[PDB]
Design a protein around this motif. Structure first.
Motif, PDB file in Angstrom:
ATOM      1  N   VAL A  15       0.849  -1.186   0.000  1.00  0.00           N
ATOM      2  CA  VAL A  15       0.000   0.000   0.000  1.00  0.00           C
ATOM      3  C   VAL A  15       0.884   1.234   0.000  1.00  0.00           C
ATOM      4  O   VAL A  15       1.732   1.413   0.883  1.00  0.00           O
ATOM      5  N   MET A  16       0.692   2.086  -1.000  1.00  0.00           N
ATOM      6  CA  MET A  16       1.479   3.292  -1.165  1.00  0.00           C
ATOM      7  C   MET A  16       0.546   4.428  -1.546  1.00  0.00           C
ATOM      8  O   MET A  16      -0.559   4.207  -2.046  1.00  0.00           O
ATOM      9  N   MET A  17       1.002   5.653  -1.313  1.00  0.00           N
ATOM     10  CA  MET A  17       0.266   6.818  -1.776  1.00  0.00           C
ATOM     11  C   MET A  17       0.483   6.976  -3.271  1.00  0.00           C
ATOM     12  O   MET A  17       1.624   7.015  -3.739  1.00  0.00           O
ATOM     13  N   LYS A  18      -0.610   7.051  -4.021  1.00  0.00           N
ATOM     14  CA  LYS A  18      -0.507   7.384  -5.430  1.00  0.00           C
ATOM     15  C   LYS A  18       0.130   8.756  -5.599  1.00  0.00           C
ATOM     16  O   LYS A  18       0.057   9.610  -4.712  1.00  0.00           O
ATOM     17  N   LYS A  19       0.788   8.945  -6.747  1.00  0.00           N
ATOM     18  CA  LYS A  19       1.515  10.184  -7.010  1.00  0.00           C
ATOM     19  C   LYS A  19       0.659  11.404  -6.706  1.00  0.00           C
ATOM     20  O   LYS A  19       1.102  12.340  -6.030  1.00  0.00           O
ATOM     21  N   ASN A  20      -0.577  11.409  -7.202  1.00  0.00           N
ATOM     22  CA  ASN A  20      -1.512  12.504  -6.965  1.00  0.00           C
ATOM     23  C   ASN A  20      -2.580  12.132  -5.941  1.00  0.00           C
ATOM     24  O   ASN A  20      -3.753  12.479  -6.100  1.00  0.00           O
ATOM     25  N   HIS A  21      -2.193  11.392  -4.894  1.00  0.00           N
ATOM     26  CA  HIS A  21      -3.132  10.986  -3.847  1.00  0.00           C
ATOM     27  C   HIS A  21      -3.922  12.160  -3.281  1.00  0.00           C
ATOM     28  O   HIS A  21      -5.063  11.984  -2.840  1.00  0.00           O
ATOM     29  N   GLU A  22      -3.337  13.362  -3.283  1.00  0.00           N
ATOM     30  CA  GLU A  22      -4.049  14.545  -2.809  1.00  0.00           C
ATOM     31  C   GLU A  22      -5.111  15.035  -3.780  1.00  0.00           C
ATOM     32  O   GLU A  22      -5.961  15.838  -3.383  1.00  0.00           O
ATOM     33  N   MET A  23      -5.099  14.566  -5.021  1.00  0.00           N
ATOM     34  CA  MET A  23      -6.195  14.833  -5.941  1.00  0.00           C
ATOM     35  C   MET A  23      -7.205  13.701  -5.927  1.00  0.00           C
ATOM     36  O   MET A  23      -8.171  13.730  -6.696  1.00  0.00           O
ATOM     37  N   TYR A  30      -4.687   5.458  -2.618  1.00  0.00           N
ATOM     38  CA  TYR A  30      -3.667   4.467  -2.326  1.00  0.00           C
ATOM     39  C   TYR A  30      -3.482   3.537  -3.515  1.00  0.00           C
ATOM     40  O   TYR A  30      -4.426   3.252  -4.256  1.00  0.00           O
ATOM     41  N   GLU A  31      -2.259   3.033  -3.660  1.00  0.00           N
ATOM     42  CA  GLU A  31      -1.927   2.037  -4.666  1.00  0.00           C
ATOM     43  C   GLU A  31      -0.973   1.024  -4.063  1.00  0.00           C
ATOM     44  O   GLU A  31      -0.365   1.257  -3.015  1.00  0.00           O
ATOM     45  N   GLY A  32      -0.838  -0.106  -4.746  1.00  0.00           N
ATOM     46  CA  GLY A  32       0.087  -1.113  -4.284  1.00  0.00           C
ATOM     47  C   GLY A  32      -0.436  -2.527  -4.394  1.00  0.00           C
ATOM     48  O   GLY A  32      -1.587  -2.753  -4.779  1.00  0.00           O
ATOM     49  N   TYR A  33       0.432  -3.486  -4.065  1.00  0.00           N
ATOM     50  CA  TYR A  33       0.102  -4.902  -4.188  1.00  0.00           C
ATOM     51  C   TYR A  33      -1.174  -5.253  -3.434  1.00  0.00           C
ATOM     52  O   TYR A  33      -2.040  -5.965  -3.956  1.00  0.00           O
TER      53      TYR A  33
END
Length: 33
Positions: A15-23, A30-33
């Motif tokens: 689980v990671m913050m997407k590049k534009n998670h603030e949008m 969130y993104e990730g496996y």
């Protein structure tokens, strides 16, 4: 039927913050496996 509340942790690459998670909101932050 109700929306299932999933607890998770920000840990790469699970689980990671997407590049534009603030949008983005909700699960879309969130993104990730």
């Amino acid at each position: 039927n109700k929306t299932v509340v999933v607890t998770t942790i920000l840990e790469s690459p699970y689980v990671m913050m997407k590049k534009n998670h603030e949008m983005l909101e909700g699960n879309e932050r969130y993104e990730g496996y």
